[PDB]
Design an enzyme around this catalytic site. Sequence first.
Site, short mmCIF file in Angstrom:
data_model
loop_
_atom_site.label_atom_id
_atom_site.label_comp_id
_atom_site.label_asym_id
_atom_site.label_seq_id
_atom_site.Cartn_x
_atom_site.Cartn_y
_atom_site.Cartn_z
N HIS A 62 -18.03 -0.47 3.86
CA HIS A 62 -16.58 -0.81 3.93
C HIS A 62 -15.76 0.46 4.11
O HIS A 62 -14.69 0.39 4.70
CB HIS A 62 -16.11 -1.60 2.69
CG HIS A 62 -16.96 -2.75 2.33
ND1 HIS A 62 -16.99 -3.89 3.11
CD2 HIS A 62 -17.78 -2.96 1.28
CE1 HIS A 62 -17.79 -4.78 2.56
NE2 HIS A 62 -18.31 -4.22 1.43
N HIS A 92 -11.64 7.49 -1.49
CA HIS A 92 -12.04 6.96 -0.18
C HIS A 92 -10.79 6.82 0.66
O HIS A 92 -9.66 7.04 0.16
CB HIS A 92 -12.76 5.62 -0.32
CG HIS A 92 -11.86 4.60 -0.93
ND1 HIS A 92 -11.77 4.41 -2.28
CD2 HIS A 92 -10.92 3.79 -0.39
CE1 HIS A 92 -10.82 3.51 -2.54
NE2 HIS A 92 -10.26 3.10 -1.37
N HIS A 94 -8.84 4.42 4.00
CA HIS A 94 -8.70 3.29 4.94
C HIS A 94 -8.11 3.86 6.22
O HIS A 94 -7.22 4.70 6.12
CB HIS A 94 -7.85 2.15 4.37
CG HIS A 94 -8.29 1.71 3.01
ND1 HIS A 94 -9.09 0.59 2.84
CD2 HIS A 94 -8.05 2.22 1.78
CE1 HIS A 94 -9.33 0.45 1.54
NE2 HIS A 94 -8.73 1.44 0.88
N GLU A 104 -2.81 0.95 4.29
CA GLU A 104 -2.71 -0.34 3.58
C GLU A 104 -1.26 -0.56 3.14
O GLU A 104 -0.63 -1.53 3.57
CB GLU A 104 -3.68 -0.32 2.40
CG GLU A 104 -5.11 -0.21 2.85
CD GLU A 104 -6.12 -0.85 1.92
OE1 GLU A 104 -6.17 -0.45 0.75
OE2 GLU A 104 -6.83 -1.75 2.38
N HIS A 117 -7.12 6.96 -1.13
CA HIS A 117 -7.03 6.38 -2.47
C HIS A 117 -7.91 7.18 -3.41
O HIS A 117 -9.13 7.21 -3.22
CB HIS A 117 -7.51 4.94 -2.43
CG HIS A 117 -6.56 4.05 -1.73
ND1 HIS A 117 -6.93 2.79 -1.24
CD2 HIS A 117 -5.24 4.22 -1.43
CE1 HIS A 117 -5.86 2.24 -0.69
NE2 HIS A 117 -4.81 3.09 -0.79
N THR A 196 -7.54 -3.47 -3.43
CA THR A 196 -7.23 -3.94 -2.07
C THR A 196 -8.48 -4.46 -1.36
O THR A 196 -8.36 -4.86 -0.19
CB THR A 196 -6.58 -2.82 -1.25
OG1 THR A 196 -7.53 -1.76 -1.15
CG2 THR A 196 -5.28 -2.37 -1.87
#
Length: 258
Positions: A62, A92, A94, A104, A117, A196
């Site tokens: 992910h 990590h 996104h 996000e 994050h 999230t």
Amino acid sequence: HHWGYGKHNGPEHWHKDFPIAKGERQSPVDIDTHTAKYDPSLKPLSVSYDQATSLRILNNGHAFNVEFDDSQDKAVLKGGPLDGTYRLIQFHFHWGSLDGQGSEHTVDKKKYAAELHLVHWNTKYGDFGKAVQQPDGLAVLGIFLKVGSAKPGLQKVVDVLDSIKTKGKSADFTNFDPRGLLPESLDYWTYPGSLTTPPLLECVTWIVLKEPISVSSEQVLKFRKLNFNGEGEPEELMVDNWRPAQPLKNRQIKASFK
Ligand SMILES: CCc1ccc(CCOc2ccc(C[C@H]3SC(=O)NC3=O)cc2)nc1
Ligand SMILES: [Zn+2]
């Protein structure tokens, strides 16, 4: 048929396995800057990362997680909206397929190229798994990435990604200093929200920094060469691993700054 970020298993499907997806304190949200209210009672954030011990970097299918030793108070977040001490467990990102999406959280509906994050858990609950069951169990520090000048402190992360291309791969990642990923200002927005990703637990105090960091086009292009798939499976580029903004419902976003 497990959750992910595709047409068939992406965010609009998550509620079927995780009904809290339609809950009262879901993340991320759009940060309406004119509506957020300055709260003069909010304290400066205390980011104490000089004793941080990074251990490993993992492609979990992910994102990639840089994991820390959280068996003692080394790297901790305190102050701001928080009561007590939150230990850094992992960070990590996104990111998008294109520079115009990937974050996000949004700011006045603006999407950034990516979002970092830094995930911390409240030490009064003893372990991470107990903390995610509590409304004040986690504090996630969110930092926007825009594409411009390179971030020197990110390059050691970029350069190991070739070694964890596919789901389930990990590599030793010691002596990484997360202070190299912070912007100058610690001005922030804060609100109560959720994880999230599934399981979407409503356990997070969100702290989103106002000042983005700059990364180079070359740095984010290397994020986009990662794979969602396992080794020996058809290649699915790890891009657009972001959940879109969720309804604010009965929440107020507070600003630490005027
Ligand atoms: C130490 C063992 C352990 C392990 C995970 C869980 C439950 C799931 O917890 C989580 C699952 C995913 C995430 C990452 C989420 S939350 C965020 O800000 N962005 C993400 O991608 C954060 C927590 N419990 C215990
Ligand atoms: Zn995240």
